[PDB]
Amino acid sequence: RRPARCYRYCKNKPYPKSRFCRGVPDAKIRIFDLGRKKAKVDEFPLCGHMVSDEYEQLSSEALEAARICANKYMVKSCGKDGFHIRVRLHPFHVIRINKMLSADRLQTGMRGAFGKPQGTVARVHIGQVIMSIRTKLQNKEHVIEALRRAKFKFPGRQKIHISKKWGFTKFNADEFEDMVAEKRLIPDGCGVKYIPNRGPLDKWRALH
Amino acid sequence: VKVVKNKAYFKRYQVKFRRRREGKTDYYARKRLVIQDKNKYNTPKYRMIVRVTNRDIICQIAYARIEGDMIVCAAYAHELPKYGVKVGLTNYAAAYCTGLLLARRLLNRFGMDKIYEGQVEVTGDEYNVESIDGQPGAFTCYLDAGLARTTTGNKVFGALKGAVDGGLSIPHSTKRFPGYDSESKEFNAEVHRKHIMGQNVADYMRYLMEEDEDAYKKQFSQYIKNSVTPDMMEEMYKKAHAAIRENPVYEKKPKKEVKKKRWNRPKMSLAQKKDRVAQKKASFLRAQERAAES
Amino acid sequence: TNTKGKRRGTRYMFSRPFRKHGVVPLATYMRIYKKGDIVDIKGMGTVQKGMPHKCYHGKTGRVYNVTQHAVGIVVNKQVKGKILAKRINVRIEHIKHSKSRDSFLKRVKENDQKKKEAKEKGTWVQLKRQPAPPREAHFVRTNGKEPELLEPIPYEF
Amino acid sequence: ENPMRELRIRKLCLNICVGESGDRLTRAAKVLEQLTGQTPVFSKARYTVRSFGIRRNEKIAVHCTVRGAKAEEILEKGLKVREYELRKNNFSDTGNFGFGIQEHIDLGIKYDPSIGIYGLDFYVVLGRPGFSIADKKRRTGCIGAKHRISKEEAMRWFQQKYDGIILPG
Amino acid sequence: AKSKNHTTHNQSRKWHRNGIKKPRSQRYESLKGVDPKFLRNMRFAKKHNKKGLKKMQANNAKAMSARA
């Protein structure tokens, strides 16, 4: 386990786990949702998300420790099934290690220069969302404090933003309450199906 | 619930071709039939297109340009009662007859009638058309089979033999004409002449008259509705070939106009389509208001 | 050290693009390739018998020889020393015309027509292609409405 | 009220899948010759088993296709053996049905002791006038939705002709 | 004792030191490399032009000079 000071801002092309890598071990994170996974859309109105500022690489172990800290503060503040946290970020870039000393100069110079896979990190663009927590209206400050506790644990500088959208959907919270009732949006689990008007008439007849 | 039938199949479906989806071309043989070698730069390559359809055969000569295909001459089977062959429009005799009419009409269009008489006395031999020095050269055309399987006895070869005896210098072999034996490699010109004149179906009409008069009246009906007897068929095609070779000029039809026209239904407009949708919306809302209460 | 074989960089270049696979169209063949025709080179993936090279894709040359079912084109290829006129034999499926010479012949025909009109009527024509001139002292119109005032917007994430 | 859209017998398939090649397979071909009056045609691999001793490219099955009045006669013999009692899962969704029989001497064959008892598959497809479009070489067109033969059409045809019983159990 | 392997630096400048040249001068293009059947056309056409062009072209030039 090498420090995160030597694996930082992007200096290589993305090298994913594929047909040509074949040697990367398992990532640290395996799951990506921690809260009420079966939460409906009208249950938790708002969401606060965590916006990066530096074009950096976040490691999977950092994502692990941050989601554990955020989950722990959420279950100590609003308890189980009072929140829904989703790590938006998924690690795919495989960093490499060129290890030596396997106190001698008589084993290997820079002869075999290409390295073996060490672990998985995640290339993060400027403005790309790290995490997103949807909660009730009364849990506004708790999401702020949870992502603030994750802020001290991610490297680099990043900000927090309470979204204008209604949860994880791409539609506005101002338009949601006035527009899901009349015509368009129908809830489908935790996601929302948006229907256009360019359908067959059997869909409109199945509605109403 | 089972299959993933058609999701992006329509979006990645490379359509083949208009004529291939209609099923009228192949293009793997058309790319070799049509395209002239480029040491000529303008010389058209003439193709006799012989298409057999139910009730009618079509014999044409065409070449190609970048805009489409240019047809110089064309002869049909429904024009044979103008030459004498009233009934039997798709027999091998009509194939030979349409090929002869096509060749005579092409040579009448080109003015090469007095020269290149061809094979007047129909014998069924291997009469290759030779060119004469000091005179305009022979017409070099090539066959088109289309999608028909060219086994021995196909009447596209009968139209070929009609064009060759009319005087079109088309290269051909004698091992796909009817009457060619398969085991013995020799060719039977008497059987080929018999099959041109149509004496085999004369023998089959004799067979039906001597075996089953009920079948002889069930099929072959229009024959005895006007008149068909085998000696008059043997004289009938013999006079029809002479009528073609004496008058191939193809008189046409006037066809001014008949100024009365409504058969097909035109399209409806965008506003009409949208108002159909609006009437459907209003009628469904009216039904949901009315029938749920009543 | 790149193992410079034939077509070692042609994963995308000699490929039929999208929704255009299958048999070759016949209007590619049915073209008039005389001598002096300024023609382009664009390689094909269907016909493998006449690929020019990976270096001559997209270039433009002059026809010197025509055969049964190919053509001969002289192409200026740039090498380390200096550009060279090279004599290539390319089949017909890989070749289309160039319309720049056709536009120049259209301009020559228009200039001959204007010169005929000039000799007829004594009218000066200015048949030289002058480039895009500076804008003249034209006169704008602002009737009916005042000009709309634009201001930059505040920053919102 | 129904212009020339008649549910007629298109063909009748006859199949015997012998577990080996040689004497029993040749005698099964002899049985199909005794039914049809014409020679059968053999089958082969695209599988290699190793559970009972056959290999790739061996004569596993014999089969034949009978069309016309002979097909109607052999269909009558098969429904006479089964006594006109099919089952509801015999009819396929494409309008075709098969049933199969054992004890081939029930078809009207004098039992030779050297041949033995071979079972025989009977598979019938239903045809309408206008099904040669999907088989002719020139213009292979589709059939259509209102013209294709379905499950209900096939079972109502079998209720109408030959006086059959569905046995829905 | 490892050395620098390969580069193309300071190469285009050496190319443009002497002014990269089009061949730029081919009037009456070179005739070799053309179809021998077309050569059997053209050479026999040229030598029978040398033989039998005299009197018809001479009288035609006299006719067009008299009409011009």
Add this chain to the structure above:
RNA sequence: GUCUACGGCCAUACCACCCUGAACGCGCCCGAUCUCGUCUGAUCUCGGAAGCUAAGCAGGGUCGGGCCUGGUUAGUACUUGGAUGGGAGACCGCCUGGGAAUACCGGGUGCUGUAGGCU
């Protein structure tokens, strides 16, 4: 206003389902004695013409799926050239120029050449 034969552009013209088709034509169909090739006249060939538009086919329709085109995305993401611009870096801002795409929305869905025939 159409169709047939050969086509050019290759989905504005493919796929699913439902209606319409007067007259030539296309077809389904009607049988193996010759030419023919098959286990099977099912496919391919041979002389038909008793019915039929049920199918192909040709039109129209689906708040149809796809395809083409136009707005939006967006003067955004990118980007030639420049600075003794900012910042520890990460990168970002400015001058001069060029400028894309998915979502979202709207419209169309064949055009024609040659030869021939129907109203």
Add this chain to the structure above:
RNA sequence: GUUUCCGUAGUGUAGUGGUUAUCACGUUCGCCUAACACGCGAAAGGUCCCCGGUUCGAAACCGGGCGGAAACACCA
């Protein structure tokens, strides 16, 4: 660390020149014996290291890991 080789019933192995579960010891049952050793006849016992790709078909051909066995690791 590098280069070769191996992994198969509880144990040591054979077997690919692709399409088996092979031998020997051990266990259980029964016999000979008064009873044991010895001997006999059967039976059970296999993830052919684990996970993937090639094909009609893999343990076999190949790859990534796992655990081992040999050889080298020298001059300053």
Add this chain to the structure above:
RNA sequence: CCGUGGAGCAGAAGGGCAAAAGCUCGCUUGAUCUUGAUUUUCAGUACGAAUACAGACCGUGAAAGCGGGGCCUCACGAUC
């Protein structure tokens, strides 16, 4: 019945291919002899490989045409 390439084309991949370059069947050795040109690597030298021609003798096909090895990218060798 659905089935636009999701199979196959000798092998490592890329490209390409559907009345096909794929599978099956029937005949055949054009995988023949010979002089030049051109492309590739390149110094515009050679070998190797390839392309379009030309002249004989042929194969197939009804003919159009196709074929002087393998659908293309490699699978090979100077003086004496």
Add this chain to the structure above:
RNA sequence: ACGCAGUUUUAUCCGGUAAAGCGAAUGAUUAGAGGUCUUGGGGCCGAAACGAUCUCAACCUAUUCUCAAACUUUAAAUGGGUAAGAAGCCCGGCUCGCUGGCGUGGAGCCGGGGUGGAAUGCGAGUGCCUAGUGGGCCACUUUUGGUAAGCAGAACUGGC
């Protein structure tokens, strides 16, 4: 007057990188919902019963999260080739053993008529002989290996 250009414009073709996308093919990958053919774990109606009920399993449908140097429908900026005339147009005629329905096509040859045919800059073309060189380095930018290096290796331009 001809000609030339590390330049631009006007047209004309070429590409598949940045970007973007994967509710689009290939490859990965997250979560919830709806549907019911399927075999497999449970208890429940109960002599057993695809006679019937709930859930998990898997599949399908419509969504949704995140990517791809060896993925891609789309597709830049930058860049590459070509043309911008008198060596070019147009007319009339001879030759051909090439080709061929045709004085058909195509090449060659002869004669005649009209140069004011994008911007800016510049006087060009060509022959011979030969030294030195064949150890490089640095910088803005685009980049490969490496944690990084005043490290090693590439591209354009400039400099030592």
